[PDB]
Design a protein around this ligand. Structure first.
Ligand SMILES: [Zn+2]
Ligand SMILES: [Zn+2]
Lengths: 89, 176, 130, 283, 275, 58, 56
């Protein structure tokens, strides 16, 4: 947050930091999706990978919950993606 | 003398600038962080295959390659962290070369996957040296053109000697 | 053990996989069908095998792991007229019921469902394992 | 007779597979060297002596916790200067025949290896050769059948639990370099799969994970991996560069005046590699 | 029996206060430490240890090393081991410790202004001239003597930030090490073990990755990356009564320690120097 | 004690947090601090109500 | 146990606030100086010693 603030005392700086993190994350997520597009998804998730995902999500949620913090079309689409609401369009 | 070494430094900068477009590679995003991978040179490997690559040395003259950088205006007495950064850079270069030599075979299978050609024994070393030289160019960009005619620094020279001894022994160990 | 007549239980080996087709909205006292569906499963992992897209009759679908609510006597479970309630392979007493008739599908027939009034048993030709 | 009809008795059992090695030449008496540890009912199915002799590995315990849980772990006996085949801590099914000198050791141990490693062709070859070698019928046949039955009993004890662990959801293990940004890790999980069930159990008992997520808490035992796995098998190699110095102080004045009774850090190199996950304690 | 127990040269100049000074015996050991084990533990969260290097027949190179006393949850100040002069006053609750200890810390970090402030404050003690000034003289002289002893400039190729792979550039941990006092530098050398040891073109690696971190804040028991390393630690009562009189017990235990492993030590043509 | 007598809640909180993050707070220092704080607060709660009644007293 | 369940006992009580001063460093023992007057149940909630020391 301080490194980003170097570029200014932006009003929504916390939201901005979260957005930048999630955007850098989505870049590599798009990379993975491109790598896997050709492959055929299954009707249901791989159970082992699903367990790993749940277990790691536990820790991720714990950390980001412990750290409490403080022009609409594309903005809201991307924000919905950030919040993982896959109903985004 | 050390003036010739300054000439060497300028020449390596200009010659890197030259070949990075004579052969249009500039894989300039990479560094010495760890062992390089063919995944970042696939096309560069294809272009390399267009030339016979046996005109390369098994060992690396880590000494002469890095000594020119040691010539800088350390007398400014403002950034000794610059000298410490140089020490870090040289040590990490030595580690990079040592790991490349130790796992040279592993890279050989990597580049067997990527462009399975007889010249791979030289392509591995060419990738190593070219990524290293891109890192050198980036380091030159980072530092300032404060090269003096002559400058003594016993500590840096000693670090160079001791690390490069390991580097040369490792490269020599590449038997065949 | 007593059961509320509002629950109807269907037993079929097929129910090892959830019978999406058999689900149907229930009507209230006003004969208004409920577009909300709540599916109860014995374990959380079961949720992954419930396809919400297979419920055109409903507008909202939610899935939860049925859990014994010690605060509710199964002899008279709480009613939720706002949603149609379906239980799949329940393992603990049903403490909640939906509008109209609360539907249950199970491959097992435990005592909890044994006394259930409405019992639909699907018959199959036997085929034994080794 | 004294005992109740049948009534399988209960006693201790030597657990290391190699304890069953015996000279097929009945006229030649032989005793295998077994460490007493073999008689501990634990996950180890190899005694310390055989482990060190054949795999270059030594057992070790890692306290874990409030309630101090003890996690089994093995450690390197590999020196710093060992190279090539010497670095194969546990050979793969495609290399054990070479790493282990079948010719130099006893036929019974060769059969044991061809059983552990799923080499049915070699097992059958040995069985037939023993059928047509020496006084097979008299006692050599019974000795061979006894050794084979013991090995098969151990393997049948291990493999079912190993498969259940493989498909297990609550307990998950991933033998690879947790530093995914590395090249010496590879498809460590695939190689572990290639290994036999009993071999997989041994790997689990020996190699501790770099990290361990219990429910919601994660413990990082290392910021690095002390060993790797490749096609050759379990390799006592540093994934990133120079080998770790292994003094091997045992087995195969002012300084002390200051350094009288004084806590000393061991120079041993334990086995840390991969990721492990568990729900609840299960202990 | 020279007692090098720095932080035990503390006298409760206040009459109502008595300083127990219950600190470790090893201070009477003529070692490279200038602070014995209990002071080290209390004020730096370090436990003294020794790491043998060559121990075959009589070559007994036993490099010293201390251990983290920081779990895998502490952060920032809680994790800093040896704070820099810029932040030590904040990391240490100087106000919560005796003024003599504060003076010792200020001398160690060369906070002469704080030293002057402390003696000025002591000026206004009831028995100031009688014995407070004597205590000041004793403590100050002892601390100054220790500091001069540590400082090598008074009357070798160990690099601490030169191990860090993946670092962008710069190092500078050695810069801050230089900025430290002679006592602090000697403490760092004595407690922190270089991850690599090169002797006359012969490199030994002790860890596959350094365990400590050095930055502007000082010495930190942090990791170069990723999460922190796991680092765990009569009045007869009714509960103390035990019930009726009536599992790798047979195997040794590998310590769950986090020794200070960081840096590269380079040794020139000199052989296995054992003096 | 002074930051309690003088109504300095900011200083009291600062001291409490510093002691929370200083020394072996959990072992016994926390209990000692709580005991001292409780004693001071008990004295203050004994005094202040009577003081206010005296203030408004006719 | 001996005493009645709860049954708050009755005894004297040191009244000066400063009597509670103790070294947070448990390894350092400390005793505050208190005048005996502190044990008089009077309006004073500071002992003579603390009063003279801090307020003159
Ligand atoms: Zn044995
Ligand atoms: Zn008093």
């Amino acid at each position: 947050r301080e490194t980003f603030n170097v570029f200014g005392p932006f009003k929504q700086i916390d939201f901005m930091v979260m957005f930048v993190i999630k955007f850098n994350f989505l870049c590599d997520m798009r990379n993975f999706a491109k790598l896997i597009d050709e492959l055929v998804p299954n009707k249901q998730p791989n159970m082992r990978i699903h367990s790993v995902l749940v277990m790691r999500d536990k820790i991720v949620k714990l950390a980001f919950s412990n750290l409490q913090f403080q022009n609409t079309k594309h903005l809201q689409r991307l924000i919905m993606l950030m919040n993982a609401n896959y109903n985004v369009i | 003398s050390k003036d010739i070494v300054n000439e060497k430094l300028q020449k390596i900068i200009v010659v890197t600038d030259g070949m990075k477009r004579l052969y249009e590679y500039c894989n300039c995003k990479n560094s010495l962080e760890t062992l390089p991978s063919a995944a970042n040179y696939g096309s560069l490997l294809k272009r390399l295959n267009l030339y016979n690559l046996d005109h390369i040395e098994m060992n690396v003259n880590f000494y002469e390659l890095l000594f020119p950088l040691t010539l800088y205006n350390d007398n400014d007495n403002s950034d000794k962290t610059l000298s410490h950064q140089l020490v870090n850079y040289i040590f990490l270069a030595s580690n990079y070369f040592q790991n490349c030599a130790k796992n040279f075979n592993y890279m050989r299978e990597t580049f067997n996957v990527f462009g399975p050609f007889k010249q791979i024994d030289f392509m591995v070393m060419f990738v190593i040296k070219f990524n290293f030289l891109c890192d050198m160019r980036n380091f030159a960009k980072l530092i300032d053109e404060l090269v003096p005619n002559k400058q003594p620094n016993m500590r840096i020279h000693s670090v160079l000697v001791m690390r490069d001894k390991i580097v040369k022994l490792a490269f020599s160990n590449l038997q065949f | 053990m007593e059961c509320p007549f509002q629950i109807q239980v269907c037993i079929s080996d097929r129910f090892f996989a959830f019978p999406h087709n058999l689900v149907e909205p229930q009507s209230d006292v006003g004969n208004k069908l409920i577009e909300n569906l709540i599916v109860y499963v014995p374990t959380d992992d079961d949720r992954l095998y419930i396809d919400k897209k297979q419920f055109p009759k409903f507008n909202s679908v939610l899935v939860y792991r049925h859990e014994h609510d010690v605060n509710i006597d199964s002899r008279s479970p709480k009613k939720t007229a706002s949603a149609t309630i379906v239980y799949w392979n329940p393992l603990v007493p049903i403490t909640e019921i939906g509008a109209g008739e609360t539907r249950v599908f199970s491959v097992l027939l435990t005592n909890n469902l044994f006394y259930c009034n409405t019992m639909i048993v699907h018959h199959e030709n036997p085929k034994c394992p080794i | 007779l004294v005992p109740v009809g049948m009534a399988p008795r209960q006693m201790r059992v030597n657990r290391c597979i190699f304890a069953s090695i015996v000279s097929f030449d009945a006229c030649i008496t032989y005793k295998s060297p077994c460490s007493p540890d073999a008689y501990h009912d634990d996950g180890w199915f190899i005694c310390n002596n055989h482990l060190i002799k054949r795999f270059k590995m030594s057992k070790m315990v890692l306290p874990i916790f409030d309630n101090q849980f003890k996690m089994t772990i093995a450690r390197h006996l590999v020196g710093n200067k060992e190279r090539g085949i010497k670095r194969i801590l546990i050979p793969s099914a495609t290399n054990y025949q070479d790493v282990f000198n079948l010719n130099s050791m006893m036929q019974a141990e060769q059969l044991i290896f061809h059983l552990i490693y799923n080499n049915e062709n070699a097992v059958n070859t040995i069985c037939d050769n023993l059928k047509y070698t020496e006084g097979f019928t008299s006692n050599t046949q019974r000795v061979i059948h006894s050794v084979y039955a013991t090995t098969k009993s151990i393997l049948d004890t291990t493999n079912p639990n190993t498969f259940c662990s493989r498909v297990s959801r609550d307990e998950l293990r991933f033998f690879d370099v947790t530093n995914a940004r590395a090249l010496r890790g590879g498809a460590g999980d695939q190689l572990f799969n290639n290994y036999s069930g009993f071999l997989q159990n041994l790997i689990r008992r020996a190699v501790a994970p770099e990290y361990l997520q219990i429910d919601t808490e994660e413990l990082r035992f290392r910021n690095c991996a002390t060993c790797i796995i490749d096609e050759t098998g379990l390799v006592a190699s540093v994934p990133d560069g120079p080998e770790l110095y292994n003094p091997i102080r045992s087995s195969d004045r002012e300084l002390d005046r200051t350094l009288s009774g004084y806590e000393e850090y061991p120079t041993y190199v334990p086995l840390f590699l991969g990721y492990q996950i568990i729900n609840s304690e299960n202990n």
